[PDB]
Amino acid sequence: PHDTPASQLELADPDFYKIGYVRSFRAYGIEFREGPDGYGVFASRDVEPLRRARVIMEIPLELMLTISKKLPWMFFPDIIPVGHPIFDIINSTNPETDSDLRLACLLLYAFDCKDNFWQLYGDFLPSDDECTSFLLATEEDLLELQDEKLASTMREQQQRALEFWEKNWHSAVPLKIKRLARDPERFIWAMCIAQSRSINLQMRIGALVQDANLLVPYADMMNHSFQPNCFFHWRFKDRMLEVMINAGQRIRKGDEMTVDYMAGQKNNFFMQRYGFSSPVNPWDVIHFTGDAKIHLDTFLSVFNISGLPGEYYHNSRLSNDGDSFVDGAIIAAARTLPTWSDGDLPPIPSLERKAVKELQEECHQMLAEFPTTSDEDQKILDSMPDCRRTLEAAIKYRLHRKLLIEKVIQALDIYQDRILF
Amino acid sequence: GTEKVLRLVFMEELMERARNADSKGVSQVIYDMIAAGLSPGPRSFHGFVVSHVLNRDNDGAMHALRRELSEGLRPLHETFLALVRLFGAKGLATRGLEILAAMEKLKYDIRQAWLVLVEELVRSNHLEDANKVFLKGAEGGLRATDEIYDLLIEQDCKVGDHSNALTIAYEMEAAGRMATTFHFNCLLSVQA
Amino acid sequence: GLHDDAKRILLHMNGQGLVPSSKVYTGVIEAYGQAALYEEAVVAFNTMNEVGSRPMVETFNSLIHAFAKGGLYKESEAIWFRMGEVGVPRNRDSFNGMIEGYRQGGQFEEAIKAYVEMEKARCDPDERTLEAVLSVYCFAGLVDESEEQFQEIKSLGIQPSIICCCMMLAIYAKSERWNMAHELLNDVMTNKTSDMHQVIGQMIHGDFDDENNWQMVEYVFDKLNSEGCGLSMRFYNTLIEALWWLGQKERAARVLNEATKRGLFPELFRRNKLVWSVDVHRMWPGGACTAISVWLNDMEELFHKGEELPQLASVVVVRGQTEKSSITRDFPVAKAAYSFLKDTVSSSFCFPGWNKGRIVCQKTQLKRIFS
């Protein structure tokens, strides 16, 4: 058969869609498939380059769970009754930093309220075993990462979650409150789901325009990319969220529909919120305290990176000969390496050669400080296929950091050869 | 291997000259290049362009270019750029505009360059052309930096041109940025 | 042939404001053609193109001669094909320049085909055309075959000029005919040709060279400036060819000194901190050998004195688009320049791997033969 990204994966139960379809959820030109990773959204038809955007999914407001960002707290689907004990817990949270906690509490209530889509949908959400969030990680996994700072942050976060459970789920609490989170692991699952699956958007319901934090069903099955096919839009009149294909992009059958979770952020943040890391994060930083600087403009020219500093892209028409070396990481490189660009005077070739070596020296030092080499790491990963999901994540963070340092060495060298035609 | 050592040795020289701006020195090295049989290079031509560029020789910069163009190499991006910067100082708006068209034909992104021409023209006191260059660019769809928009609106209002200023404000808006009190205050100066 | 002055005149004309007219370009390319600054010539033609002024056939017959001075046959074929579509006829000097370019280069078969095309088009072959047809059989091993054109020249007109007599003498001397050619040598020295054609011939025979005897040929050397670099360089090249192959090497390769002092042989040698080479792209095989003899010695003269050696010493023998080709070795000059070097010096030098159109020597390698 045809090779497509979707082919490898298997179709999900008919019931994922049905539960939604009876309520007014509609999907157009899309499927849904499952695999070891979890659910993902794929295409089932070909769309030619288009003049304006096309809707792939429409999700109504009632299915969702939502809280406002600012102080008067307004919950739009409005599940919570007036006078219920849960509001006191939600009200006593710092307005600025903790929204994760507020969202967790709401989700737990939803599981206890009858005829709420969530009672049915939660069955499809990730379990304690299958979620990659690091809130659910042991001392050992935290150790494997090999980073002191990421590790520390995670522990402070794990403690913040426990403290809340102890303070509010004490002995005297009314049973309505107790049933919602009897054990402390349940609170943690909820915070894990809130952090990993939350979306922030501005919504207009009626005449009120507010900014909110929301948990939305069926749109959480999209995956991250830094070169994204689709986006999220609020249609006010029918009170719905629309997921839409970007204008001008050809999409072929079997392809993966993707969205971008946060923009401009490094791999450390992705791990704290989502437990995912990318080999190519265009925005990652490798730090050199070394004095030397290569000239900027030339860097761009050899590797055909065009654009303003904020937005760098590889022009591929200029690169008639099919190239592949230039990717997210070479772009990442441009931003990080210290550079000198002055006036229009051209760089002296010998003068720069000194710089390349001194810079590479720092890279060798960096790679060495770590306990294991890149090839060693692959081996550990390959050794055990079934393992705690958090552990595979930690090892993969390491492989990725190292691999970017290595790519830079390879790249700085190619500069040398091409400076002199 | 051997070529490398030699190619490397020759180049250090071209550069040495280019920085001190002797276009002539380079020319000999350029002829030297055909003698050693060292291949003509886009990078090599670059030094020459800069040499005239350093010293305000329009004919010269163009002259170099004409040769490279004839050789058949597609010129490196930076070279075209310096040309624009120089041409811009000197008010050669049409000529500068002409360079841009070529940059496009050889599959290049022209946004970065367009901004440079417009910016310089204002420092070099030829506002009328600067406005004309921006508007043409805007029609095409080329987006602009925030700082540029602001410069043009302020400068025009100080001289007195309401017409050009409002046209630019309207375009900032259509592109996406919306006005703030700064922009209005400038406009009001001419209005009152 | 001054082109520095041509560039100054063009700059002053551009500063004035008047757009340059058509003929101006024709001359410049001819000036540059002599020095082989093809790129410099190319930009001049292109400026003619940039103006968009219609180009007269004069520009085309100047460009064919400017491109034939070096020996780029592919450029000649390209411009000849473009002349067919631009809408101009092919006159006599165009074919003359084409065959002249083919002479110093390869492809000896196309010359007779182009001449039979001239005959088909009723080109009315002139004296230069017949000289070129005679030279067609000169560079090749066809000594006895190159005699019917000589008889045609002797019959239809006066005896051929010295540029043909000395050429035929060198051809006879290249084969196994040394003493039978002395009577043909005395023929050109005991005939009723022009006045200056009589003194030429005694400058090679005998001694004839001292503070006063060699001063007599100075007048003949300075009077030939009326040609305008057209046949003067041809005359000097043919003289060196007929003098060095069979004769005294110290007596033959000494005309290059006064030729460079005159300004008719430029860029025979490149000297710089990075490069130190010799361009013989517009020269025939024998004299190349001679300069080298001087070149080695000129260096030796500097050698005791002391001086940094170049990073790469090249020998520009063949240029043009054809440079990156394996067909380069087939060239007429290639067969013999290499030969002289092969006998005289240890051959570290050979064709470069990046460009197979010259002969280069590495720095360390040059030092070894020098010592």
- DSSP characters for C154-166? HHHSSPP-HHHHH
Q: Other C-beta atoms within 10 Å of C131: how many?
A: 22
- Residue A177 and residue A164 in contact, taking contact as beta carbons nearer than 8 Å: no
CA-based angle C200:C206:C207, to the nearest 5? Answer: 100
CB neighbours of residue C325 within 10 Å: 15
- Of B12, B80, B70, nearest to B46 by C-alpha is B80
Q: Match 């190159």 to its residue by tokens.
A: C146
What's the CA gap between C210 and A222, in Å, rounded? Answer: 98
Contact (CB, 8 A) for C99 and C108 = no
C-alpha C142/C-alpha A59 separation (Å) is 93
Residue B46: list chain A partners with CB under 8 A. 346
> What is the three-class DSSP state of A214?
strand
What does the DSSP 8-state code read for residue A70? S
d(CA B132, CA B122): 12
Contacts of C285 (CB under 8 A, 6+ apart): C241, C332, C333, C335, C336, C337
Tokens of A269: 């943040």
Residue at C67: amino acid letter: F
* Largest Cα span, chain B: 74
Closest CA to A63 of A25, A113, A14, A109: A25
Name the one residue in this structure whose structure tokens are 């340059």.
C20
CB distance C233 to C262 below 8 Å: no
Q: Distance (Å, rounded) from C-alpha C170 to C-alpha C246?
A: 7
Question: Residue A127: exposed, middle, or buried by beta-carbon count in 10 A (0-12, 13-18, 19+)?
Answer: exposed
User: Which residues of chain A are within 8 Å of residue B15 when distances are taken between CB atoms?
Assistant: 346-349
Helix (H, G, I), strand (E, B) or coil at C206: coil
- Give yes or no for a contact between C35 and C4, defined as CB atoms under 8 angstroms apart: no
Residues β-bridged to residue B182: none
Binding-face residues of A in 370-399 toward B, CB within 8 A: none
3-state secondary structure of B168: helix
Nearest to A192 by CA among A161, A214, A155, A221: A161
A345: contact with B, CB 8 A cutoff: yes
Which chain B residue's Cα is nearest to C39?
A: B67
> What distance in Å separates the CA atoms of residue A61 and residue C252, rounded to the nearest whole number?
102
Give the position of tokens 């000059």: C333
Instruction: Name the residue in chain B with its Cα closest to that of C36.
Output: B31
DSSP per position, C214-283: TTHHHHHHHHGGGS-SSSHHHHHHHHHHHHHSSS-HHHHTTHHHHHHHHTSSTTS-EE-SSBEEEE-TTS
**Gaps in chain A after residue (C–N beyond 2.5 Å):** none
For chain A, the helix, strand and coil percentages under 3-state DSSP, each to the nearest 5: 40, 15, 45
Query: Distance (Å, rounded) from C-alpha B2 to C-alpha B187?
Result: 66
Tokens read off for C299? 């260096």
The rounded distance, in Å, linking the Cα atoms of A308 and B133 is: 19
Residues of C in contact with B67 (CB under 8 A): 39-40, 42-43
Instruction: Give the chain C residue nearest B59 (alpha carbons).
Output: C11
Judge: B6–C311 Cβ closer than 8 Å, yes or no: yes
Length of chain A: 421
For residue A321, the SS3 value is coil
Q: What does the block give as tokens for A117?
A: 């889509």
Q: Mention every residue, 6+ apart, whose C-beta is less than 8 A from residue C330.
A: C106
Q: How many residues can be counted in chain C? A: 371
Output the CA torsion sign for C126, C132, C135, C137.
Answer: negative
Maximum Cα interatomic distance, chain C, rounded to a whole number of Å: 65
**C76-99: b or e for each residue (b if 16 or more CB lie within 10 Å)?**
beebbeebeeeebebebbbbbbbb
Residues of B whose CB is below 8 A from A310: none
Interface with B, mutate which of C37, C39, C50 (most B CBs under 10 A): C39
User: Kind of pairing, strands C276-279 and A312-314?
Assistant: unpaired
Return the residue matching tokens 């909110």.
A212
State how far the Cα of C311 lies from the Cα of B93, in Å rounded to an integer. 45
Q: Which residue of C has its CA nearest to B8?
A: C311
- Contact yes or no for A64/A212 (Cβ under 8 A): no
Across the B/C interface, how many CB contacts are shorter than 8 Å? 70
Residue C204 neighbours by CB under 8 Å, 6+ apart: C242, C243, C247, C251
The B-side interface with A (CB below 8 A) comprises 4, 7-8, 11-12, 15-16, 18-19, 39, 41-44, 46-47, 50, 53-54, 76-78, 82, 85, 107-109, 111-112, 145
Q: What angle do CA C297, C266, C367 make, to 5 degrees?
A: 30
Which of B2, B29, B35 has its CB closest to that of C277? B35
The whole-angstrom distance between B187's CA and the closest CA on chain C is 43
Q: Which of A136, A135, A81 is nearest to A110 (CA)?
A: A81
Q: Which residues, at least 6 apart from A338, have a Cβ–Cβ distance to it below 8 Å?
A: A288, A290, A292, A293, A294
Outline where chain B has alpha helix (H). 2-20, 23-36, 42-54, 58-71, 77-89, 93-105, 111-123, 127-140, 146-159, 162-175, 181-191
User: Given the structure tokens 């999409």, which residue do they identify?
Assistant: A251
Which of B29, B39, B63 is opposite residue C355, by nearest beta carbon? B39
Extended beta strands in chain C, E state: 270-271, 276-279, 312-316, 358-362
Q: Sort out which chain C residues have CB atoms less than 8 A from B32's CB and list them.
A: 270, 272, 274-275, 277
Amino acid identity at C185: L
Looking at chain B, which residue has its C-alpha nearest residue A419?
B43
State the Rg of chain A over Cα: 25
* Residues recorded for chain B: 192
Q: Are B153 and B171 in contact (CB under 8 A)?
A: no
Technique that determined the structure: cryo-EM
Burial track A346-364 (b if 16+ CB lie within 10 A, e otherwise): bbbbeebbebbeebeeebe
Q: Least CA distance to B4: which residue of chain C?
A: C354
Tell me the nearest-neighbour CA distance from C280 into chain B, angstroms: 10
CA A322 – CA A332 distance, rounded (Å): 21
SS3 at position A392:
helix
Give C264 to chain B, closest Cα distance, Å: 19
Q: What distance lies between CA C172 and its chain's CA centroid?
A: 21
C-alpha span between A310 and A302 (Å, rounded): 19
**CA nearest to B41 within chain A:** A421
Q: Give the 3-state secondary structure of residue C223.
A: helix
User: CA separation (Å) from B87 to A342, B9, B151, C105, C267?
Assistant: 19, 33, 20, 44, 35
Terminal Cα-to-Cα distance of chain B (whole angstroms): 73
* Tokens, residue B81: 């750029």
Closest CA to B61 of B45, B72, B73, B50: B50
Q: What is the spatial distance between Cα A135 and Cα A154, in angstroms, rounded to a whole number? A: 7
DSSP annotation of C54 reads P
Cα nearest neighbour of B42 on chain A: A421
Distance CA(C146)–CA(A218), nearest Å, equals 93
Amino acid at A140: E
Query: CA nearest A412: which of A254, A303, A322, A249?
Result: A303
Q: Cβ of C367: how many Cβ atoms within 10 Å? A: 12
C-contacting residues of B 28-67, CB under 8 Å? 28-29, 31-39, 59, 63, 66-67
Q: Which tokens in the block code for residue A54?
A: 């096309």
Which chain B residues are closer than 8 Å to C348 by Cβ? none
* CA A314 to chain centroid: 23
CA dihedral B168, B173, B177, B179 (to 10 degrees): 80
Enter the resolution in angstroms: 2.7
C59: CB partners within 8 A, 6+ apart: C22, C23, C25, C26, C29, C45, C48
**Residue C56 backbone dihedrals phi, psi, to 5 degrees:** -70, 155
Residue C275 touches chain B, beta carbons under 8 Å: yes
- Is residue C255 classed as helix, strand or coil in its secondary structure? helix
Contact B112 A349 (CB under 8 A): no
* Number of helices and strands in chain C (H, E): 19, 4
Q: How far apart are CA C96 and CA A407, in angstroms?
A: 60
Whether A346 sits inside 8 A of B12 (CB atoms) is no
Cite the DSSP H helix spans in C175-229: 182-189, 195-199, 216-223
| Cα gap A222→A256, rounded to integer Å | 9
CB contact under 8 A, C11 and B59: yes
Q: Specify the pairing of strand A230-235 against strand A198-205.
A: unpaired
Residue A104, token pair as written in the block? 């967790």
Are the C-beta atoms of A291 and A358 separated by less than 8 Å?
yes
Give the three-class secondary structure for A240: strand
Q: Are C23 and C44 in contact (CB under 8 A)?
A: no
In terms of Cα–Cα distance, which of C77, C74, C80 is closest to C61?
A: C80
* CB-CB neighbors (< 8 A) of B70 in chain C: 39, 42-43, 46
Tokens of A259: 């969205």
Please name every residue paired with A27 in a beta bridge, in sequence order, or none if there are none: A57
Q: Rounded to whole angstroms, how far apart are CA atoms C148 and A242?
A: 93
Cβ atoms of residues A47 and A251 within 8 Å: yes
Please state, in angstroms and as integers, the Cα–Cα distance from residue A123 to each residue in A20, A119, A127, B130, following that order: 13, 8, 9, 63
- Radius of gyration for the alpha carbons in chain C, expressed in angstroms and rounded: 22
Q: Which chains touch A (3 or more CB pairs under 8 A)?
A: B
Mark whether C and A touch (3+ CB pairs within 8 Å).
no
Closest to C361 (Cα-Cα) out of C297, C322, C309: C309
Quick one: which of C177, C200, C178, C170 has its CA closest to C188?
Answer: C200
C86: amino acid identity, one letter: V
Are residues B32 and C277, on separate chains, in Cβ contact within 8 Å? yes
- Rounded Cα gap, residues C138 and C165, in angstroms: 12
Could you tell me if B93 and B121 are in contact, meaning their C-beta atoms sit under 8 angstroms apart?
yes
- Count CB neighbours of C107 within 10 A: 14
